[PDB]
């Protein structure tokens, strides 16, 4: 018969999911950013430019004001419109003569007389073109990795766990278990050898696996605990939908008090643990201790949740069980993010190198 | 006594292995390829070359035909033989004058009068030499990562699971359990506290851990299931070797219906799960529920598989148990592949950058 | 009641920790080193330099002796002091004229007459400056990844497992279980629903979870084994602290005979397994089978270890349980090491590329 601690294995696997929710899942690493370095290289290039080039960025009436492109349209026989935004950003502080001199000193160009500045400028123009070319990576720009944020991943985790973008508070305010579909009795809610559960997310699955009820506190209702049953008072034959107080008595078995570093490997391992614990039968697969007939909570029956999407003839948990597929999608996005972090480190290092060379007076000559 | 669900933990660990077999294990990422970019850079260089250089690639009698190296041997006072294959590949489409002009336009060289083309050619020759140098990585070329394919890894997984290059069909056609060595009774086949099993692969281990037999359908034969026993009808005291129908009734407890993204971390975690479930004793280590004496299938005995290669005094599963060592070898090859993917991303980005610069008329001048 | 094999799950999780100790944990990959290549590039540059530059590195009285900087101080109107150590290292073998000629040949410079050597030298000086700039990565230099060694990580693992820098031998010489704090009886040592254990490390936790004692050899003392109890003879009501012989009878359930490839993912998975097996109650969390009251070793009580740092209202194992936090710190250091390996591969490839170009006579011209 099912008794104290018999579902510790399944509780551990499901709490490995629940612990990821809320705002607890955190990315190891942000995508490398090198815009600062690119902007500095472009500004250094503008600082080294001939005065007549910087003058193109000035208003014709006030040399300290940036050129207005309605007042002074860009010539259509050039490609200047293709580059103006970046050039104007580099030029803006330099329109002030004192700031231009301060930038000359910052970039180690202030010691150069005209012919030596021309020599340096030739190298700088080459280095700057190389920086712009290297800072392009069409395989990352606008990709999944670039468009996906940590907040986006957290919301998707909360969708898998709670069917909501945010984790319910300790009273489960705003949340209705089983999507409002609970009815009849525990085995109707949690499933059986022939029918699936009404649980669409991980938290309601955990509730089916671990909640005590009015009739099993002496035995099966201790399946997920050490000694004291959770004490939900759930009475699904009378009131099918558990209250928020009941849900929280089960959620507090899980680690909701810290953070988790999001990695694809960490999600993969958690999904593999849950997925392979599913016991495949002819019409359903069962998560949790099961001895006979259904997941009714009786010590001779089961403390479990059942799925019809996966059986001994069909189905893959991470594709066919919606909440698991949602988390697998997070895994895939993390794989893309991790590859983008590796790839973007290259232009980051390249641009730091170029800035070093561009500030090296001997190299420039 | 051993009863329903008592081996769910061990079944889950072993099905985590079986699910990798067939063609289900898939690489996250192919090795970055940059041959397209290198070939384009070499072709651009040939397009920019002086006409007398391209003429070296022509037959002396028909200028549209590539030079034949028996008819017109390469001069031995040059290094041309060291480079001819790549040069001739770049030159081949360009031998047609109209195609040469089309390539000049494709590569943004068609606007250049002779002196400006010479200036551009100087930069292109430098960029092309840099591309060739960067496209070399002797630490990846001909390495394990380069020589190992996804098909190779799948075959090695199937060797660990089935001792075959391909996964047996649903009737286990062509397969003989226990390498034909099963005899006597279940405990002889599956092992004991004093002797090892006849199972050399993971599928036959799973069979020992999870198969019901004629005498345990009411009890221990339900160790891996929820309710209904698998129904093999195995009768090893009369006919020791199980049939393909019997094997499939156990294999269908595992997820053979989807795919798995092969990563070193995913294999490591699966091997660590199995390896640490091995219960080390004085003469054997046991995988599966075990109460007394041997893995006979009796509810008072064990539903398990035993190994003599690992004990409480010696042995490491991933080195000393052949099927686990075969999968650990896959893990090692995946680590090398993953490092090669990271390393090859560098020349890939470098060559894309060079192509950008080589097609930039302002940079070339 | 707790009996044979009931703690196999918890033993497996804890042995996944113990197996990392000793010197068994090994890094997949050393940080890429490119000092050899940088040194070669600097030496090639010095080999190509004009004789009057190499002469700056000679003693004024013996041209085969390196310049002494007290005898011949460096001019303060130069930056030579900022570069002297690297230059002098490059110059040292070259002070011998025959060795200088041998290096000219090694670096493919010996075919160059003066004007062609000057042309090559211009390119070499540029390539060498680029190599120096690329070989800088301030995000790795003196970072956690750079300062952390494999020995350092092994010692930290042994601190988590044993509270010592090195793993105790097979007699546990030099080791005292429970930090010398064991007293009274098993439940005082191992904890309960109301009090924490005296175990501060993973090995003593494993002892609480898996040791038999004088009164449970027929039942609960078999929780971690297959058949034969460990046979410690522990009698904590009389002599609380177990002996080294007793500790070794439990440690030998774990894989202490092989090696483990240290990765952040491998540690993360092991910590997640242990952490989520902790059964959270009102005043303590319990690792191990637990039926009633305390971890006394009685078959009706528990074979377990308790922690007050984590409960159903507070605490995260990898932050608040010291031994788990120590191992989580290893995970974090491994993440930094793994990122440094990826990042340092870039300058490694860059410097190999530069060496190739610098030894290419056609490129240099
Ligand atoms: C780092 O800092 C440097 C400055 O030190 C900065 O350099 C500037 O780069 C830009 C972009 O490469 C250069 O832009 C070119 O400008 C010329 C000159 O335009 C003026 O003078 C002409 C001639 O008198 C006038 O007609 C014109 O109205 C302007 O007054 C333009 O001629 C260039 O445009 C042609 O070439 C481009 C390709 O390079 C084409 O994309 C473009 O469509 C134009 O082609 C057309 O005209 C061609 C005539 O030769 C013809 O051949 C084509 O068929 C077609 O009809 C171009 O816009 C600018 O001169 C540089 N400034 C200086 C002072 O040198 C770098 O940009 C900066 N680096 C970075 C990365 O920001
Ligand atoms: C991008 O596109 C460019 C073209 O724009 C292309 O350039 C070609 O590169 C190759 C390889 O670097 C150059 O090959 C050289 O060719 C010369 C000339 O050979 C002809 O003329 C000589 C003299 O009249 C004849 O003797 C000969 O029979 C040919 O008719 C060769 O002299 C070169 O070989 C020597 O130098 C090499 C090192 O660079 C040695 O490896 C080789 O063994 C040779 O050395 C021998 O002779 C030397 C004489 O100087 C002597 O010093 C040595 O001791 C030894 O005895 C070399 O083969 C070719 O000229 C380029 N073409 C043009 C038009 O410039 C790039 O290859 C392409 N980029 C890529 C990456 O594909
Ligand atoms: C690869 O191999 C090459 C050799 O082929 C090697 O090149 C050497 O590089 C170093 C470092 O860049 C060069 O060092 C410079 O040396 C000059 C010359 O000093 C002598 O001659 C002067 C003039 O007669 C004397 O005054 C002096 O006492 C020496 O006899 C120095 O003038 C340079 O120092 C000034 O410029 C530096 C910036 O580049 C400043 O950091 C430094 O503070 C100095 O500035 C001061 O003086 C300036 C005068 O112009 C003035 O403008 C400033 O305001 C300030 O007052 C510098 O030390 C050396 O010449 C190169 N050797 C050759 C033969 O070319 C590469 O180093 C090597 N590559 C690598 C990476 O190792
Ligand atoms: C589950 O199975 C038990 C044992 O047969 C039965 O008593 C319950 O009614 C059922 O839900
Ligand atoms: C396994 O152990 C049981 C219990 O003692 C015994 O009945 C079987 O014969 C043996 O194989
Ligand atoms: C643990 O619980 C059992 C069962 O009530 C009791 O007999 C022991 O004394 C206690 O330590």
Residue numbers in the entry:
A (entry chain A), B (entry chain A), C (entry chain A): 24 to 388
Copy out sentences from the published article reporting this entry, exactly as the authors wrote them.
VSG11 and VSG615 are related to VSG3 (the topologically-similar class of monomer/trimers with O-linked glycan PTMs), denoted as class B or N4 in the literature. NTD structures of VSG11 and VSG615 were solved to 1.23Å and 3.2Å resolution, respectively. Both reveal a fold similar to VSG3 as well as the presence of O-linked glycans on the top surface of the protein–one observed on VSG11 and two on VSG615. In addition, alignments of the VSG11WT-Iodine crystal form with the VSG11WT-Oil form show that the second helix of the three-helix bundle displays a significant conformational change in the region near the middle of the bundle, the helix becoming disordered and forming a random coil in one monomer while keeping helical structure in the other.
The mature VSG proteins are attached to the cell surface by a GPI-anchor, and consist of two main regions: (1) a large, N-terminal domain (NTD) of roughly 300–400 amino acids that is most distal to the membrane and (2) a smaller, membrane-proximal C-terminal domain (CTD) spanning 80–120 amino acids beneath the NTD that harbors the GPI-anchor. Therefore, at the heart of antigenic variation in the African trypanosome are the NTDs of the VSGs.
